[PDB]
Paper text:
pmcThe mature HIV-1 capsid is a conical, fullerene shell that encompasses the viral genome. Here, we present structures at 2.6 to 3.5 Å resolution of CA hexamers and pentamers within in vitro assembled conical CA-IP6 polyhedra from multiple lattice contexts differing in local curvature and geometry, alone or in the presence of Nup153-, CPSF6-, or Sec24C-derived peptides.
We obtained separate reconstructions of the pentamer and of the hexamer to nominal resolutions of 3.1 Å and 2.9 Å, respectively, and used these to build atomic models. In the hexamer, as in the crystal structure, interactions between neighboring CANTDs around the symmetry axis are mediated in large part by residues P38 and M39 in helix 2 contacting residues N57 and T58 in helix 3 from the adjacent monomer. Within the central pore of the hexamer, we also observe two IP6 densities coordinated by rings of R18 and K25, but density for IP6 coordinated by K25 appears to be weaker than that of the pentamer suggesting lower occupancy. This is the conformation observed in all lower tilt structures (and in the average structure shown in Fig. 5E). The dimeric interface formed by helix 9 is remarkably invariant across the core surface, and matches the structure and minimal plasticity observed in previous studies. At interfaces between three hexamers (independent of tilt and twist angle), helix 10 engages in a symmetrical three-helix bundle, held in place by a hydrophobic patch which includes residues I201, L202, A204, and L205, as previously observed in helical arrays.
Numbering used by the authors:
A (entry chain A), B (entry chain A), C (entry chain A), D (entry chain A), E (entry chain A), F (entry chain A): 1 to 86, 96 to 221
């Protein structure tokens, strides 16, 4: 993070060892389940590009995913260089924190019109983590179907946990929650849900189908 | 949370990783048992809408419940937009922290007459968590009955833990504690309780029925 | 708790998540063993009524006990209303933190002559926790008796752990420590203790009876 | 502890929940092994009598020992009252924190000539914990003897761990370390030790007898 | 680390016990897997040479590796002495924190033109940890080959985890990711990958080969 | 530690309970393996003699070692008294923190020419811990020999972990690393090592002998 020193100048605060241990535990245990993106944004809230790189580089496992992340960051950095022909003006590799010093990063982040290289880079990281979260999804929403004995609440949990990983825009997810959620319910359950009509909320669907 | 910087301006404090881990543990382990509402209010005490969204989005399981929560927040945000036709005046989606920046959220929360979008949104969240807590209750108070060998204290614990989840107003809960608590006691126990008359406190009921 | 802001005004400090987790662990594990009262007073040291309510409401189990606590607090609040007919003058429900805002609570607690609603309410809570601790005692001091093979130290531990829960005033507890402690010792042990005469301290009793 | 407020007046700091949990763990697990006295002095370093009472009252087990502690504190408080016939002048029960408010305790501890009631009371507590540590010693130093197959280092560990609990003054402990340590060694080992003569240090004794 | 005292002079902050326990856990558990270098740089962010030596000296196991580290630091210190013939000008052993006091180290690190002996020494340490990480790699990238039944994602994880340890420059690693990654895939998988042509990204390779 | 109060005077900071628990865990678990000396110096970084005594006195086990430590400190204190015939001038027992108050210790440590009794005493402690670490070494370097099937890396780890405990000066340790390390290698391994000649570094030795 960045903290102002008592001497009246902008200074780095090192990302806490407790925060790094929390992030490493998150990635190693949850294995790019979609709640990894909000944990990244939460743990990384004030991060410089050096702090962001520290979070990525300390992940030990999943080096296939962490490579997909690096090469996503490289194409985002390339598009930045294309959009911004040449404090310095930061190149994409400066925002990615590879060709810039910590003092340049703080210089940009605290400039009079701030150039928020920590936020820009955290966007490119979250774009890469999105791609990874989609790829690590073990199944796709059209293949989520309710078992003949399965509680509708457990099927709904599976459906929406899969729908978090799915790529499509909110208009398509709206269509999925309207149509697929009913269509993939089991034969007894689906009758209950159809009897509600198309406007049923998820609360109405679950409470109507509770204990079917 | 919000904290004033030493430079004399309002600034964000990121929700602590320890607080996020505590909240995620609460939701994942206690699975919307009613003590989740007070743990939410306790852990979320100073939260901006960005902090509130961070707490909701980091929950990994229970995505059926977390969807019921989101669509509750959306209808609360819609009613806000209806009640408040158009710093900006915050739209419901601004209070829900989706269409507003963190700097707008802090701007409202620290305005000279403060517009407390963190508190307003935390109300809408607690309304959704209430609906979820009721739905995740495995049984209803009229079906809580004492076993013929069950200690009256364990039945009272089951009864009042169920009565926390129940929807009804305090006048109805008063009626439930007066009538159902006696009526659903086992045949030996119920005689002891009836002998106290209708005015008995819960201490009087439990101490009279101890070791029946 | 209450903390003065750097801007020169009284402000809330939220009860720490670590303190809440510690209190919840205390209540859930120790199940109103008498050391719950001092842990409450220790963890709750600076608490406003909102903080006190947060501590009570986050307990998940023991909802029979937590109901006995609420209805104790209600009768204490009723006696306060009776003793104090009508910053505002706080009603009993204001001190219990149900009809008062956090800003009213801090207003009273930091008034020029402070009205210490956090301390008053913590007294009513400890009165209720006392009643609960007595009721959750599995046995009573006149039924604590030493086994023929049991070490006198283990019997003394059982006796005084029971004597903590017992209701009676210190004059009665003095009589209990003088008479019952000897009278309920096992037949070999009781001879050793009687040989000391009535003035023996607990150290003298235990050291004389060690390894009997 | 005591901390000066930013408003320029002496104020209480509540004993940390982590410190209380550490003390309770110490007492419950180590069961008045002699390292409990230094852990008490370490955890209690700045304590007021209210903090000291909080540490004692939160111990759940060992209520025989905690009673011996209370009645030791009472006789120390009685001797204080005898030595000091009557801010107020603190009575022994004021120093024990039972008849004094926290504001009186801080008033004495921060008086212009400070009256250090926290240190005085911590002395009386450590006197009681000493008596308890001696009584909870499972054996006495004259009964610590080396087994015929036992390593001299393990016997030395047993001997000095017992010698910590023993009551006697340093002159007597010096005699014990000189004479009993050799005299109670096993028959082969004792020959090795006798060959060193009476002036041998414990390092010389252990290194000479290593691997006997 | 270094922190300015409130008296207006540069002062040491001791490396936290939590940070030391975290580093010792990292080295002892992860056993110079390549994520040890970023954990070192993360935990050591503000370190003086005394703090760096404290991190190295507290490692208990792996004393073969920690000797390779010391003798790497010695040759780096020798090259520094060669490059810099003779506050003092720091000798290599001063930068390694062996012949310099903590007050000299802080004197250099806070000099008007700062001489950043903590950063210089942390470079020499990371050079030694690199050599160790390469040597502790159980296999080399040309020997990483996919099993006939092994998922391509697990092979990619093994390949890139090995490629982290490998010595070669980024141009050689680029060649390895282009050619060896395909060449060492199993016979069915390798056909899928070859069908993409040479320009395929790792995302394209993994998504094309998913569930082969 | 020592911290300046906001009132402008030097004051004690109590050694943290987390630091004491960390030290007690270190000593009890690692049992004077040589990494105990750097953990002591790390955890004790700012310690007064009272803090140092608190660290020693809270160790529960190993009372043979802790006695060797005390009597080492006593002879160091005696040599100090001999070297320094008589704020006061501190006697050796004042530096050992037994005959001095905490306010005398802080008085010396913050004197205008500081008399650093905490550092002096920490030296005497580390001298005693060295003697203990040597004595608790289960074997000596001339008896460390490689098994016929044992990996050379595991033998090197055993050798250098033993060489940490060994008493001798760096010139003798240099001779040991040059000659004994080869001489005590197993018959196949020793041929590989001899083929390198006498100038081989430990990296060269281990990499040449890897997988023998």
């Amino acid at each position: 993070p960045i903290v102002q020193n008592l001497q009246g100048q902008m200074v780095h605060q090192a990302i806490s060892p407790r925060t790094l241990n929390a992030w490493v535990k998150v990635v190693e245990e949850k294995a790019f389940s979609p709640e990894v993106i909000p944990m990244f944004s939460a743990l990384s809230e004030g991060a410089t590009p050096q702090d962001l790189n520290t979070m990525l580089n300390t992940v030990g496992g999943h080096q296939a995913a962490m490579q997909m992340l690096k090469e996503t960051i490289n194409e985002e950095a390339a598009e930045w260089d294309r959009l911004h022909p040449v404090m310095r003006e930061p190149r994409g590799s400066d925002i990615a924190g590879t060709t810039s010093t910590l003092q340049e990063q703080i210089g940009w982040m605290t400039h009079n019109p701030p150039i928020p290289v920590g936020e820009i880079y955290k966007r490119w990281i979250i774009l890469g983590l999105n791609k990874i979260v989609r790829m690590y999804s073990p199944t796709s929403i059209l293949d989520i179907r309710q078992g003949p004995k399965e509680p509708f609440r457990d099927y709904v949990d599976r459906f929406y946990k899969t729908l978090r990983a799915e790529q499509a825009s909110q208009e398509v997810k709206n269509w999925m929650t309207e149509t697929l959620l009913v269509q993939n319910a089991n034969p007894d359950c689906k009758t209950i849900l159809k009897a509600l009509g198309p406007g049923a909320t998820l609360e109405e669907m679950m409470t109507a189908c509770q204990g079917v």
